[PDB]
Amino acid sequence: SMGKLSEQLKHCNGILKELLSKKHAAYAWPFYKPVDASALGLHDYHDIIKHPMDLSTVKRKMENRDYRDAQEFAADVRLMFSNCYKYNPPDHDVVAMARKLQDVFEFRYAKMP
Ligand SMILES: COC(=O)N1CCS[C@H](c2cccs2)CC1
């Protein structure tokens, strides 16, 4: 009863499915679920990152029709990557992973009809 996604949002939904797919798992896995700061001992994470975001939250928002347009979806995906660049030193392995997954995202987002 949620309504058909617009053409641009269908493209966004396809990108999201790709980001979650097995073929990108080697670098996408840190982004699948909310950072569990407690479990990882990152007791400063929520002081530094005011707006956490991750792919499972983006998926829930897409399914719930929270995104009004492609720009709102893109801003959330980019917020997730920016959080990673903000919290971690630039030479961290997770930053390299973020950069790889963000390239997948940005190159396909640039193909939106
Ligand atoms: C998007 O995930 C993050 O930014 N995290 C914060 C610290 S790096 C940690 C990792 C350690 C080793 C590889 S991934 C994942 C959680």
Curated annotation (Swiss-Prot):
Indicate the secretion signal residues.
Answer: none
Q: Which domain of life is it from?
A: Eukaryota
Domain annotation Bromo: ranges: 3-112
Per UniProt, subcellular location reads as: Nucleus; Chromosome
Miscellaneous comment in the UniProt entry for this protein: Some specific inhibitors of BRD2 that prevent binding to acetylated histone are promising therapeutic molecules for the treatment of cancers or inflammatory diseases. ABBV-744, a small molecule, has been tested on tumors with success: ABBV-744 antiproliferative activity is mainly restricted to cell lines of acute myeloid leukaemia and prostate cancer and is able to displace BRD4 from chromatin. GSK046 (iBET-BD2), which specifically inhibits the second bromo domain, is a promising therapeutic small molecule for the treatment of inflammatory and autoimmune diseases.
**Per the similarity annotation, which family is this?**
Belongs to the BET family.
Domain note for this entry?
Answer: The first bromo domain specifically recognizes histone H4 acetylated at 'Lys-12' (H4K12ac). It also specifically binds histone H4 acetyl-methylated at 'Lys-5' and 'Lys-12' (H4K5acme and H4K12acme, respectively). The second bromo domain recognizes and binds histone H4 acetylated at 'Lys-5' and 'Lys-12' (H4K5ac and H4K12ac, respectively).
SUBUNIT field: Homodimer. Interacts with E2F1. Interacts with (acetylated) STAT3; promoting STAT3 recruitment to chromatin. Interacts with CTCF; promoting BRD2 recruitment to chromatin. (Microbial infection) Interacts with herpes virus 8 protein LANA1.
Function in brief? Chromatin reader protein that specifically recognizes and binds histone H4 acetylated at 'Lys-5' and 'Lys-12' (H4K5ac and H4K12ac, respectively), thereby controlling gene expression and remodeling chromatin structures. Recruits transcription factors and coactivators to target gene sites, and activates RNA polymerase II machinery for transcriptional elongation.
Protein name (database record)? Bromodomain-containing protein 2
Taxonomic path: Eukaryota, Metazoa, Chordata, Craniata, Vertebrata
Which part of the complete sequence is present?
Answer: 344 to 454 of 801
